[PDB]
Amino acid sequence: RVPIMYPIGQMHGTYILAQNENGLYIIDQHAAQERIKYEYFREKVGEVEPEVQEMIVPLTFHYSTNEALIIEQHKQELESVGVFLESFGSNSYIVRCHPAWFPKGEEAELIEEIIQQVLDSKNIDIKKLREEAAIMMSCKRHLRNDEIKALLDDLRSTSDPFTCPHGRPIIIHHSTYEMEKMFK
Amino acid sequence: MDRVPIMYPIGQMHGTYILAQNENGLYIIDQHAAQERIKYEYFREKVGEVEPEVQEMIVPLTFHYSTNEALIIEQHKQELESVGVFLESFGSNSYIVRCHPAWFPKGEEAELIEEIIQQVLDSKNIDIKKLREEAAIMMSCKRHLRNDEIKALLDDLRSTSDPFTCPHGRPIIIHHSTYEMEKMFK
Ligand SMILES: [Zn+2]
Ligand SMILES: [Zn+2]
Ligand SMILES: [Zn+2]
Ligand SMILES: [Zn+2]
């Protein structure tokens, strides 16, 4: 957590500069937006029955006898993250629909990316898959002052305003104390 | 040394720090330390000048001393001369100050003149070079800035001999290069 951050400005269209009583905050815009998107998708994937949307271009996949074994093992886990596989023929599946909240235009690559995660873990439970899926979903010109403000406000009210879902810094903070030291 | 490239303002915080940037990255600036450096070189130039525009005072200043101080003060009457302190002796060990350089920090013209004098009285035996410096420093130390003010400050800091360090040895500028920032955010 962190108190209200007041915008100073932005630079190179990459970083936001802000301040409050605790000192100075340098904020990576992109990282901040991953974190904010994550808090959203992590909730969405936790829903038992999400609004569903029928695709326009349905997808097909095909797997080795072994990959299909793993996929049948993880039916419930895959469906719980929004991947609705229907097997037609041998080791082949169609995807006919998905949650309405999947990131538009990247459903195809998301579904295949999630399915690939399961094939790699070989044995994975729902909680871990939900985390992984939401991380994947989260990473699917200069900002206006109103845009900087919404961003600082949204970031502040997430679970971890300091670190992106991939574990990288969102915020470099120079405290009042640290700046006093820096300069004396 | 390498001359810092032009800096562009982002903003300020707490009436204490200036935020700036250019292609090279981010600059965090102690605005007071910056103002010191600027003013220091300005006054260090003036006090090194040969003939300054002098300004008479409405009410001259009076200074009384002992047989020691009046002794020292009368020895350095060319060193306090160039430093801007003009002591006219009328009685025994007694001086009046009619005038002083027009570029003397207003309001505290007297406060300063005494400090320059004090410095002399303290070091006891002190040469031109040291006094000259000490005087410049005293004049430079003698609210939230807008981006226009911030800009003017950045340009002036650039033109100095040492934009990174104040006359007291403390850092003026903390620089994060674009590469170093990318490293910090991995
Ligand atoms: Zn990303
Ligand atoms: Zn990330
Ligand atoms: Zn000062
Ligand atoms: Zn200083």
Side-chain angles (χ1 to χ4, degrees):
Chain A
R1 301 211 293 265
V2 46
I4 292 152
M5 285 171 294
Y6 298 106
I8 294 177
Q10 62 73 48
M11 61 173 285
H12 299 170
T14 304
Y15 306 104
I16 289 167
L17 293 75
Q19 59 83 12
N20 57 40
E21 182 190 1
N22 298 334
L24 170 80
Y25 303 86
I26 312 173
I27 283 148
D28 182 304
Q29 301 176 189
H30 179 83
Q33 291 153 148
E34 290 182 354
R35 160 62 51 200
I36 297 168
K37 281 157 70 178
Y38 174 90
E39 300 293 306
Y40 174 75
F41 290 112
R42 188 56 190 83
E43 177 183 350
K44 302 310 291 185
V45 303
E47 301 174 2
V48 164
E49 37 177 340
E51 169 175 359
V52 173
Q53 166 189 324
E54 188 216 277
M55 309 209 56
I56 275 297
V57 181
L59 318 171
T60 71
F61 307 88
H62 318 272
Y63 307 100
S64 67
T65 288
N66 292 344
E67 284 169 339
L69 290 170
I70 305 171
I71 291 177
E72 281 304 320
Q73 232 203 278
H74 299 257
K75 273 314 190 185
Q76 302 311 320
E77 292 72 29
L78 288 166
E79 302 180 20
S80 85
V81 295
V83 175
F84 312 121
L85 294 173
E86 299 168 82
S87 58
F88 182 81
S90 162
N91 304 344
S92 76
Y93 294 89
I94 68 169
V95 176
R96 210 130 63 119
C97 61
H98 56 74
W101 46 262
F102 267 23
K104 179 159 186 173
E106 17 220 0
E107 306 82 348
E109 178 182 358
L110 174 59
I111 293 170
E112 201 200 64
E113 189 174 14
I114 291 178
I115 287 174
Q116 198 62 34
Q117 175 68 45
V118 168
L119 294 187
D120 298 350
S121 266
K122 294 156 174 296
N123 189 220
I124 187 175
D125 77 334
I126 298 184
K127 181 148 184 65
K128 193 187 197 305
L129 189 61
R130 280 179 160 151
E131 150 104 335
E132 247 65 66
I135 292 184
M136 294 175 187
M137 289 175 197
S138 71
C139 41
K140 295 290 176 293
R141 68 172 189 90
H142 292 168
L143 299 188
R144 317 181 203 100
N145 294 280
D146 55 284
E147 290 180 293
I148 300 178
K149 293 241 260 178
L151 188 163
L152 292 170
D153 288 356
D154 279 352
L155 178 64
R156 201 173 76 80
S157 57
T158 66
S159 77
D160 189 11
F162 286 101
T163 321
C164 86
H166 310 109
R168 286 167 196 129
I170 304 180
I171 303 165
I172 305 287
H173 176 45
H174 297 320
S175 66
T176 308
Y177 169 97
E178 287 174 310
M179 301 183 87
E180 288 176 342
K181 289 256 304 177
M182 275 181 167
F183 288 102
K184 288 168 185 53
Chain B
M1 189 173 180
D2 274 356
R3 173 104 42 204
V4 183
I6 301 166
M7 289 171 281
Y8 304 101
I10 301 171
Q12 68 86 47
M13 61 181 280
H14 306 175
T16 309
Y17 301 112
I18 282 174
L19 282 317
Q21 65 77 33
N22 62 29
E23 278 193 291
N24 288 317
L26 173 72
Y27 300 89
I28 304 167
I29 303 176
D30 188 297
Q31 88 187 25
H32 183 90
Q35 293 165 341
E36 286 189 357
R37 161 59 54 186
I38 296 172
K39 277 182 174 184
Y40 166 85
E41 314 209 346
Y42 172 97
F43 292 112
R44 185 56 192 92
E45 174 162 14
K46 296 294 184 169
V47 53
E49 307 283 327
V50 303
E51 293 178 349
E53 289 184 5
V54 191
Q55 234 202 356
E56 174 181 318
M57 275 174 283
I58 303 300
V59 179
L61 294 164
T62 318
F63 297 101
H64 314 285
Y65 306 110
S66 128
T67 212
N68 322 343
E69 29 227 37
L71 207 88
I72 313 180
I73 295 176
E74 191 71 45
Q75 170 181 171
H76 308 131
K77 234 202 173 75
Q78 318 129 221
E79 349 211 1
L80 277 138
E81 248 191 24
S82 55
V83 169
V85 191
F86 302 81
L87 306 112
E88 306 172 6
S89 66
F90 299 84
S92 141
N93 299 357
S94 176
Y95 298 81
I96 290 175
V97 178
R98 284 174 39 198
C99 49
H100 65 242
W103 46 263
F104 258 37
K106 275 71 147 49
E108 38 234 337
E109 283 98 354
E111 173 190 348
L112 180 63
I113 289 176
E114 204 130 34
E115 195 176 359
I116 296 177
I117 286 172
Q118 291 292 169
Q119 185 64 38
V120 177
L121 271 23
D122 303 340
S123 296
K124 271 133 200 308
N125 181 46
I126 156 182
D127 72 331
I128 270 193
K129 230 275 217 56
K130 191 59 59 270
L131 192 54
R132 288 259 186 81
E133 174 195 345
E134 295 283 315
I137 290 178
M138 280 142 43
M139 306 187 208
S140 53
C141 299
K142 216 105 300 175
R143 207 260 301 185
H144 298 203
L145 308 174
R146 293 164 273 113
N147 272 17
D148 54 349
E149 299 174 271
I150 296 180
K151 181 51 190 176
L153 184 152
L154 305 167
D155 298 336
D156 295 332
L157 186 63
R158 273 196 72 243
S159 312
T160 64
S161 78
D162 184 12
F164 292 92
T165 308
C166 80
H168 304 91
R170 281 162 223 115
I172 294 173
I173 294 178
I174 306 292
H175 173 56
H176 298 315
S177 69
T178 80
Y179 176 82
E180 288 153 20
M181 279 193 283
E182 288 179 355
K183 217 174 182 186
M184 295 185 336
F185 289 104
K186 308 180 171 304

